[PDB]
Design a protein around this ligand. Structure first.
Ligand SMILES: CCCCCCCC/C=C/CCCCCCCC(=O)O[C@@H](COC(=O)CCCCCCCCCCCCCCC)COP(=O)([O-])OCC[N+](C)(C)C
Ligand SMILES: CCCCCCCC/C=C/CCCCCCCC(=O)O[C@@H](COC(=O)CCCCCCCCCCCCCCC)COP(=O)([O-])OCC[N+](C)(C)C
Ligand SMILES: CCCCCCCC/C=C/CCCCCCCC(=O)O[C@@H](COC(=O)CCCCCCCCCCCCCCC)COP(=O)([O-])OCC[N+](C)(C)C
Ligand SMILES: CCCCCCCC/C=C/CCCCCCCC(=O)O[C@@H](COC(=O)CCCCCCCCCCCCCCC)COP(=O)([O-])OCC[N+](C)(C)C
Ligand SMILES: CCCCCCCC/C=C\CCCCCCCC(=O)O[C@@H](COC(=O)CCCCCCCCCCCCCCC)COP(=O)([O-])OCC[N+](C)(C)C
Ligand SMILES: CCCCCCCC/C=C\CCCCCCCC(=O)O[C@@H](COC(=O)CCCCCCCCCCCCCCC)COP(=O)([O-])OCC[N+](C)(C)C
Ligand SMILES: C[C@@H]1CC[C@@]2(OC1)O[C@H]1C[C@H]3[C@@H]4CC=C5C[C@@H](OCCC(CO)CO)CC[C@]5(C)[C@H]4CC[C@]3(C)[C@H]1[C@@H]2C
Ligand SMILES: C[C@@H]1CC[C@@]2(OC1)O[C@H]1C[C@H]3[C@@H]4CC=C5C[C@@H](OCCC(CO)CO)CC[C@]5(C)[C@H]4CC[C@]3(C)[C@H]1[C@@H]2C
Lengths: 92, 92
């Protein structure tokens, strides 16, 4: 579950925030939101930053249409596989 | 689950709200948000009160960078251990 997290957080941060200098915030932002997704927070208005209802309209740019695909895959793997494998683990 | 709640709510309220006089609101605020976290509410924009997207920018201060670590631990214990132990309890 922590590998699936960084498999997602590093492409997400890199596609959406390219013009970043080295900063310890990069360590946070690859790990922060993807963890809070495990706990019910979809960040519905930060998906598809190029949308009209977006809360991150300044983040719209080239390649940012990839992030909703990435996150669809992410949560499928987390909840529909890895959370229920863990429910299955405990119950058995 | 109620002990894990107060293990979290009392450090959270104390790190973020230091300049408080005695008040019956302290009884609420150590118990209120941590309970609503069990039920899907991550309070995504009250985590990291020193962030740009914060809804509590006036709460930013010394030591408030500790609260996202505390809450990461909190929900791990609630859902990933204590909710699924309870799913496991009932099913067995
Ligand atoms: C192997 C397993 C197979 C998986 C299943 C198949 C996968 C699903 C496939 C879905 C098809 C793809 C949909 C996008 C189509 C093109 C979008 C486009 O051109 O314009 C849009 C861009 O929007 C984007 O670029 C966002 C991309 C879509 C994200 C989909 C995430 C998956 C969620 C669901 C996953 C579950 C799927 C459930 C299946 C039933 C917007 O239009 P525009 O003119 O560019 O902009 C208008 C301006 N505005 C934005 C300000 C309003
Ligand atoms: C289930 C039923 C679903 C329906 C199926 C029908 C599919 C139809 C396919 C439509 C694709 C073509 C439409 C857009 C044409 C290009 C121009 C455009 O609008 O680009 C948009 C992005 O989107 C793209 O650039 C294209 C996205 C391609 C992938 C779509 C999913 C492939 C099928 C599924 C496979 C998935 C893999 C699954 C893995 C498990 C850019 O628009 P924007 O984002 O608003 O940004 C504009 C602003 N900006 C210039 C500042 C950036
Ligand atoms: C034993 C078990 C091991 C556990 C695993 C390892 C634990 C994970 C470890 C993560 C590493 C720590 C990340 C923070 C790094 C420093 C941040 C910094 O310097 O600046 C940031 C401060 O931000 C903070 O102070 C918030 C602290 C991070 C909260 C992380 C919570 C854990 C969520 C994930 C947990 C799951 C982890 C998943 C693992 C794959 C911001 O930068 P700034 O310049 O200060 O401010 C810029 C201004 N601005 C804010 C207005 C924009
Ligand atoms: C998995 C991969 C993850 C990546 C790993 C890489 C780690 C890199 C480590 C980076 C730490 C150093 C960077 C910051 C330097 C100090 C200055 C600074 O910006 O301070 C910031 C806070 O943050 C801190 O003060 C430091 C946080 C230390 C703990 C980080 C996690 C330790 C590793 C994990 C262990 C966890 C235990 C797990 C338990 C299970 C203050 O910034 P702010 O918050 O925006 O507030 C500013 C405004 N104010 C002045 C009003 C307050
Ligand atoms: C394969 C499933 C079916 C889909 C088939 C059809 C799709 C085939 C694949 C990809 C289609 C790529 C073209 C679509 C973009 C057109 C619109 C556009 O310009 O968008 C963006 C750029 O986008 C790019 O520059 C695209 C980057 C190259 C593609 C990288 C591979 C991604 C998919 C993985 C590989 C594929 C395999 C994945 C396996 C599932 C917008 O940038 P811009 O134009 O500069 O906007 C101006 C910005 N400004 C205003 C802020 C200045
Ligand atoms: C251990 C895991 C790896 C991490 C190792 C590296 C980290 C090692 C540990 C801790 C690092 C502490 C220093 C980081 C803060 C630097 C930036 C700063 O000033 O932040 C804040 C202060 O912060 C403090 O004053 C810190 C308080 C002391 C640390 C208490 C222990 C916490 C961790 C538990 C013990 C550790 C064991 C935990 C086990 C997991 C900001 O306050 P300020 O400066 O006044 O801001 C101005 C505010 N104004 C503008 C509103 C006026
Ligand atoms: C196998 C796993 C693959 C993913 C991963 O773990 C192992 O690989 C690690 C490498 C880390 C980076 C290494 C060096 C720096 C430079 C630093 O520069 C301070 C600049 C300035 C502050 O303003 C000084 O004053 C910023 C942080 C950064 C980019 C690290 C981020 C976290 C990264 C990406 C880690 C990540 C979790
Ligand atoms: C084992 C467990 C450890 C945690 C815990 O349970 C037991 O320990 C309890 C002690 C309680 C406090 C005791 C006294 C007061 C003073 C009062 O002062 C009114 C001031 C003014 C109003 O404006 C009068 O007019 C405000 C409330 C406060 C601080 C209690 C808060 C809840 C606390 C922290 C409880 C908490 C749930």
């Amino acid at each position: 579950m922590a590998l699936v997290l960084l498999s997602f957080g590093v492409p997400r941060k890199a596609i959406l925030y390219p013009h970043e200098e080295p900063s310890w915030s990069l360590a946070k932002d690859i790990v922060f939101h993807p963890y809070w997704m495990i706990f019910g927070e979809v960040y519905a208005y930060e998906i598809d930053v190029c949308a009209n209802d977006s809360t991150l309209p300044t983040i719209c740019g080239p390649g940012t249409w990839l992030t909703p695909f990435l996150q669809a895959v992410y949560l499928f793997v987390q909840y529909i596989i890895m959370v229920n494998l863990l429910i299955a683990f405990f119950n058995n």
